[PDB]
């Protein structure tokens, strides 16, 4: 279910933020956040992102490698806009995505409040937990 | 009717984007409460430096002077 | 100076070519009587200006009425080049028997207008699609002035076989015939077909008696607001080229709608207002365009805006700015600020404004597909052939005509949705 | 028509806010490199007790053999 | 040195700061023009040798906006520091703090951030709110917000105008005031109340004027702020201090809401008549019919009191003022502060303004005291904020706006707060 | 600026309309003709401010006739959205097979207006409940501008079906089918009635020979007063949402009953006095409302005021401080200070002062349910069913607005002496 199960997260975030809306319609922050966000034993998904996308290993992630991850998934590679997906939690340098990142948008995205912050890109970190 | 559907879905997503540019606004806000904080703190920094100078500078100037009358 | 000469053909050209150098007349302040009362017109001993218009057709009677109208005093006895059977609707008799016999007292003509010059930086037609004397024939000459003169611009306001009805029965033949030795030689291509001119003389203008002459003020005063950007001081000015560089990315993808602006009802130009968002408005609105094709059901491969008035510049920036900002996708993206903008210094007779749209697109290729559909309709199954089968010609190239307007189409269509 | 207006404002707020987005992103890198700026002001404040110190040790000895 | 800023925001604010101005210029002799034919507080340099005042007006409502700024004081303001909202809050906290608040919050933060880097020697701000409107409630206290979170070290006098006692020109006035007391509890230093009804009693029944309107309020409360700030724009006998007030009338940060009294008030028609000796004032001083606002003086417990001599006083009459003040029984201070008195003699008497009601007279005095009668205010606003609270009326105004529902018990009891410790502190031992 | 836009709806809505513009015309100062001798104008070359005011009917007769009355040229000849059939007194007719065709020429035309404008902080609209044409086309254009502007209040103003007797035979039908839409997208209904307009027209006025002229003349000067606090100045300004929450505890209990003041004898017009006590007493006097609902009969949720004229605040005060003291338990006692205050600083043209009241309070309660009383009657009984159900209506809508009718009010009636 490599496909439909992307297309599932997505359609349940569609729903969920019908829900969100619905919630109004009837009635160092970062840092401080991050801290107290979920601490779980995270050596599962450090070892399984190293093991998964982390080649040279250091510190260090492009679009080539998750363009390779997408396509030996039999997904069909988009040629161009997999940037995006490499871009849209970028927030300190573009086309930088340190071991750091993937902790500070994992942390951010796994608790929080409502979420909707990508909702698109650490669905494949979901993905790849998921098996 | 799939016009409609993504067109609702935009909204909500751009919804979802200005939630996120505001949020962005208010820790802002915070970096530059907390940087003038510290600019102050470590201004204190380089008084105390300068202060330890002439504390220092004096020390010395008493001691030249005992020198030649305890021998 | 950077001339033009007004060749004309077909009793439509013939008409619009009257009107448009009454427009011309009564713009640049010259009678019917021709004085001032040189880039269009040319100096006369007694102090009188002659249009270096040039009138053929293969019939007189189109050219006596020309001639017995207003204005009629412009052009001088010898650019009437009488033809005398007329090509009676066949586009084998507009363009073989009676073209290889009109060519060279065409030819003689046109090097005398054009020695009249210095430096004749375009040309000018209008002509038709179906009618056969239009057709052929100015096409014909096309094909002529391109094989001497390789370095001009070639320009053609040409109107097509009408949608609803064919204003000839042979008009698919005919435009077909047109298009295929149009593509090659003629480097910009007004688009004008009559229905479409009838919508935009209705619609909003009140007009509910129109008449010929009436179609024929209208595209003339479009006709002139397309280049009074030459004669004319301005702010930011243009040409022919740098205008055919900026709307043809390829020679091939080089036919162009026109548009111009403003144009709103009488009774009520009161209580409106008038100003340059409202010109925006008025053209980047679909329905004003002169072809029947709509062209938000295609794409911009690219498109030119001329103004004429003095405002700021502020204006045209924030113009071009805003609208593809809205109809991005309505352009092409493949191309950066795919609008171009220019700006004449004058405004019109009267008025405050004048705004001219032209457009380098892909909604046209449907207008060629249907064109190519009623064509290979009557062509299959025969219907209207011994007209030019008799004559001189055969359908090895009317089937190659076909299929040339196809590929012309299948590179339109292929432009409008090529990206990377 | 409502769908061609639907997707003219889409694209136009999309891109505006996306701008500010970055705007916003580049107010936090400031962040990023004063935090490493005054982190250097701060070890520059440790050279407080310690120079202090060096006065203070100073004292004892100049003191003491004033004394 | 001593320079002091000036916020008038709301409709309230922005019209007792137009009187405010209207009455600085007549007194230093500053002609509307912005021509004159020391200032060094309100008014700056501008290369010509002309005075630009150092305040902002702000209001989401443009009304009064284009009204001074088409009146006849055009010549004074800059136009810098006139911006203007196209809507307004609603009368809703919600729509003036969360919503219509931010876009301006930082244009007028830019603008006194230049302001404050054009005078060299800030001494202190004062914000003019009425907060019963959305503006006067909501971006006020974001903009006393701001001011404390960037400034911070400065004293913030505000001269609030809460929710009458009774009267109201709003239904929605308890939701949107309680919501305001949170951020003014932080954020304004020291806060001199305003209320409507002893005004109105004072204009009614004092200058025998038969209808009290509110250009005549302003100019009033114009007349009380100069007799405020004569000590510092005029040289005086012995010269009190701003941050003195403070160290003196804040005996603990949580009790600093303070009330205020002028004297004298008459007409000609009886300042002709009256003797109105220096020891004569000093009753009709702590008068209880002469109060400013909604306090009753023997309801609180004075805790401090500065009084504001002008003119020509001479020291032992107010001496011996305080003394016989201190003897009779009918006023009485906390035990905790056995000398509650701070006083400040100034040998420039009222200026008179050309078409007022008010009378020029040899001395004048005015009273800000920090006791603990206020809480009786605070009680009163909490009586409509309960009453409105517990039937769910226009919280669809307020949560329909980024604002969530909790918030106004919070402010409930953050003023409850205040009610608390104003009985706790003022006790015996 | 805080632009409105003025839709209309009805013969009744077009009449009202028409001398609600002849009134402010008359007030600012602007001739039948459009000049001055922008919060309601716009700007038109030649110096014309043309009202943005937009007719929509079913029948034109109304149209031509509004046309023709004087001050008729305000109105630009766009803004004239003709219907050619009539709904003929349907709801059907006027909701579903025309509204569904004619709700996009006013989609484009409100657009029009609405980007016109920079800031439109409210709407416009005064149809009726009872006509077909009014009643349907009126709150399904409310319906639509409230679904693509969700940002901006609604506000109509409603007249209902008579008490004494029904203006159409489906006056019931009509009505619910009105106020079943009108709850949930309509943010202001000042509720008017005929009769009772005759009522104010008639008792303290000497009207002997009243026309429908006149009681707009009436109703066009209390929908000025209700406003004009907002384009001229004050010491004391508020808007439409000032107001909207100083009114509504609720989202439902938001229909509204209006009066304006001063009205009284001409010939005793010498005899009395004029002060702002005597306005508080012509007022706060029972009869001088337009509803056919004594307020008293009920209690006052809250109500607001609205001052023209430059007296002193004190006044204001001492006025809904008085009235609230005696009148007391005529309000509900469970708001504070439910009596909100507001000073326009202009007086009305040629006299002294004048004082709008509205009203957010529980006695239109009683309206609403003699209207759902003679919808169940007919509606059980089958009454004039076939009319609505053979155009593609069913009475499961029926029914549910009827029941929501009855649910509005139960809210009402529980709200008006729930105390705690
Ligand atoms: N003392 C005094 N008070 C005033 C004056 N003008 C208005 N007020 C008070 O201000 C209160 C309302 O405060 P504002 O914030 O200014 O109301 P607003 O400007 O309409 O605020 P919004 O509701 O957001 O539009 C009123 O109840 C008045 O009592 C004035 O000139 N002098
Ligand atoms: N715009 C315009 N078009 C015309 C006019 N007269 C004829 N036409 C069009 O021109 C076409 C006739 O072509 P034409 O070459 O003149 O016919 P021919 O001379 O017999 O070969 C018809 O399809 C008409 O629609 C006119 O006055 N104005
Ligand atoms: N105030 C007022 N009401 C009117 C006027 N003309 C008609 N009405 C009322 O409007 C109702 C008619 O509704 P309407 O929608 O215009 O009828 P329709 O156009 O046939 O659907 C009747 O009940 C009348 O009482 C008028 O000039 N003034
Ligand atoms: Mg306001």
């Known amino acids: 279910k490599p496909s439909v199960m992307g297309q599932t997260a997505n359609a349940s975030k569609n729903l969920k933020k019908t829900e969100k809306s619905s919630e109004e319609e009837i009635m160092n922050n970062n840092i401080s956040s991050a801290q107290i966000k979920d601490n779980n034993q995270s050596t599962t998904k450090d070892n399984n992102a190293n093991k998964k996308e982390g080649s040279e290993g250091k510190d260090y992630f492009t679009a080539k490698d998750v363009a390779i991850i997408l396509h030996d998934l039999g997904y069909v590679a988009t040629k161009a806009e997999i940037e995006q997906m490499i871009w849209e939690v970028d927030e300190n340098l573009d086309n930088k995505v340190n071991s750091y990142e993937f902790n500070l948008m994992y942390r951010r995205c796994r608790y929080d409040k409502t979420g909707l912050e990508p909702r698109n890109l650490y669905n494949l970190v979901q993905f790849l937990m998921y098996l | 009717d799939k016009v409609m559907i993504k067109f609702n879905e935009a909204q909500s997503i751009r919804k979802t984007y200005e939630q996120i540019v505001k949020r962005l606004k208010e820790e802002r806000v915070g970096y530059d409460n907390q940087l003038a904080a510290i600019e102050r703190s470590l201004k204190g920094k380089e008084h105390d430096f300068e202060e330890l100078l002439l504390l220092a500078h004096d020390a010395t100037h008493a001691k030249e002077l005992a020198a030649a009358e305890l021998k | 100076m950077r001339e033009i000469v007004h060749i004309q053909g077909g009793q439509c050209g013939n008409q619009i070519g009257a009107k448009f150098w009454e427009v011309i007349s009564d713009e640049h302040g010259i009678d019917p009587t021709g004085t001032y009362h040189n880039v269009y017109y040319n100096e006369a001993t007694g102090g009188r200006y002659v249009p270096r218009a040039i009138l053929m057709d293969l019939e007189p009677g189109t050219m006596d009425s020309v001639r017995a109208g207003p204005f009629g005093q412009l052009f001088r006895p010898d650019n009437f080049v009488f033809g005398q059977t007329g090509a009676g609707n066949n586009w084998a008799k507009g363009h073989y028997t009676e073209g290889a016999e009109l060519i060279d007292s065409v030819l003689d003509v046109v090097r005398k207008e054009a020695e009249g010059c210095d430096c004749l930086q375009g040309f000018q037609i209008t002509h038709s699609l179906g009618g056969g004397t239009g057709s052929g024939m100015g096409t014909l000459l096309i094909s002529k002035v391109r094989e001497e003169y390789p370095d001009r611009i070639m320009e053609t306001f040409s109107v097509v076989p009408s949608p609803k009805v064919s204003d000839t029965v042979v008009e698919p033949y005919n435009a077909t015939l047109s298009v295929h030795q149009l593509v090659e030689n003629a480097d910009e291509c007004m688009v004008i077909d009559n229905e479409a001119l009838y919508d935009i003389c209705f619609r909003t203008l009140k007009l509910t008696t129109p008449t010929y002459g009436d179609l024929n003020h209208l595209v003339s005063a479009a006709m002139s607001g397309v280049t009074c950007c030459l004669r004319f001081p301005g702010q930011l000015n243009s040409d022919l080229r740098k205008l055919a560089v900026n709307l043809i990315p390829f020679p091939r993808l080089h036919f162009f709608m026109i548009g111009f602006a403003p144009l709103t009802s009488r009774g009520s130009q009161q209580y409106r207002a008038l100003t340059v968002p409202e010109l925006t408005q008025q053209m980047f609105d679909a329905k004003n365009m002169m072809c029947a094709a709509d062209p938000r059901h295609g794409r911009y491969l690219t498109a030119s805006a001329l103004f004429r008035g003095r405002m700021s510049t502020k204006e045209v920036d924030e113009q071009m700015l805003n609208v593809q900002n809205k109809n991005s996708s309505y352009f092409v993206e493949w191309i950066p600020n795919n609008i171009k903008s220019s700006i004449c210094d004058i405004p019109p007779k009267g008025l405050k404004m004048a705004v001219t749209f032209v457009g380098n697109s892909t909604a046209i290729q449907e207008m060629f597909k249907r064109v190519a559909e009623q064509f290979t309709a009557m062509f299959r199954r025969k219907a209207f052939l011994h007209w030019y089968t008799g004559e001189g010609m055969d359908e090895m190239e009317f089937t190659e005509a076909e299929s040339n307007m196809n590929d012309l189409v299948s590179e339109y269509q292929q432009y409008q949705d090529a990206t990377a | 028509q409502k769908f061609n207006e639907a997707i003219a404002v889409n694209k136009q707020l999309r891109q505006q806010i996306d701008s500010l987005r970055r705007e916003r992103v580049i107010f936090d890198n400031l962040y990023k490199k004063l935090e490493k700026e005054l982190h250097e002001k701060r070890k520059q404040m440790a050279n407080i007790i310690e120079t202090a110190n060096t006065a203070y040790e100073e004292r004892d000895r100049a003191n003491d053999q004033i004394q | ?429």
């Open chain 5, 1 to 429: 040195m001593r320079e002091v800023i000036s916020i008038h925001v709301g409709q309230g604010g922005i019209q007792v700061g137009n009187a405010c101005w209207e009455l600085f210029c007549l007194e230093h002799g500053i002609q509307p023009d912005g021509q004159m034919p020391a200032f060094n507080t309100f008014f700056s340099e501008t290369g010509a040798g002309k005075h630009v005042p150092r305040a902002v007006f702000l209001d989401l409502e443009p009304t009064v906006i284009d009204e001074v700024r088409t009146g006849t004081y055009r010549q004074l303001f800059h136009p810098e520091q006139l911006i203007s909202g196209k809507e307004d809050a609603a009368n809703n906290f919600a729509r003036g703090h969360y919503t219509i608040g931010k876009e301006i919050v930082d244009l007028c933060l830019d603008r006194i951030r230049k302001l404050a880097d054009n005078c060299t020697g800030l001494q202190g701000f004062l914000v003019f709110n009425s907060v019963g409107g959305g503006t006067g409630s909501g971006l006020g206290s974001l903009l006393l917000e701001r001011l404390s979170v960037d400034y911070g070290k400065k004293s913030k006098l505000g001269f609030t105008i809460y929710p009458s006692p009774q009267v109201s020109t709003a239904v929605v006035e308890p939701y949107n005031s309680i919501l305001s007391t949170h951020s003014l509890l932080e954020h304004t230093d020291v806060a001199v109340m305003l209320d409507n009804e002893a005004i109105y009693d004072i204009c009614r029944r004092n200058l025998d004027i038969e209808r009290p309107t509110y250009t005549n309020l302003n100019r009033l409360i114009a007349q009380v702020i100069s007799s405020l700030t004569a000590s510092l724009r005029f040289d005086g006998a012995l010269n009190v201090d701003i941050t003195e007030f403070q160290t003196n009338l804040v005996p603990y940060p949580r009790i600093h809401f303070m009330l205020s009294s002028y004297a004298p008030i008459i007409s000609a028609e009886k300042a002709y008549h009256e003797q109105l000796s220096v020891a004569e004032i000093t009753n009709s001083a702590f008068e209880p019919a002469n109060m400013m606002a909604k306090c009753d003086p023997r309801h609180g417990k004075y805790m401090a009191c500065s009084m504001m001599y002008r003119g020509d006083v001479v020291p032992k009459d107010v001496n011996a003022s305080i003394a016989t003040i201190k003897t009779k029984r009918t006023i009485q201070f906390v035990d905790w502060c056995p000398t509650g008195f701070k006083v400040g003699i100034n040998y420039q008497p009222p200026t008179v303004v050309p078409g007022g009601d008010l009378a020029k007279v040899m001395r004048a005095v005015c009273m800000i005291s920090n006791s603990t009668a206020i809480a009786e205010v605070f009680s009163r606003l909490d009586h409509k904020f309960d009453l409105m609270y517990a039937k769910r009326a226009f919280v669809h105004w307020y949560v329909g706006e980024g604002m969530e529902e909790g918030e106004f018990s919070e402010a409930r009891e953050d003023l409850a707060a205040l009610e608390k410790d104003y009985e706790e502190v003022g006790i015996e031992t």
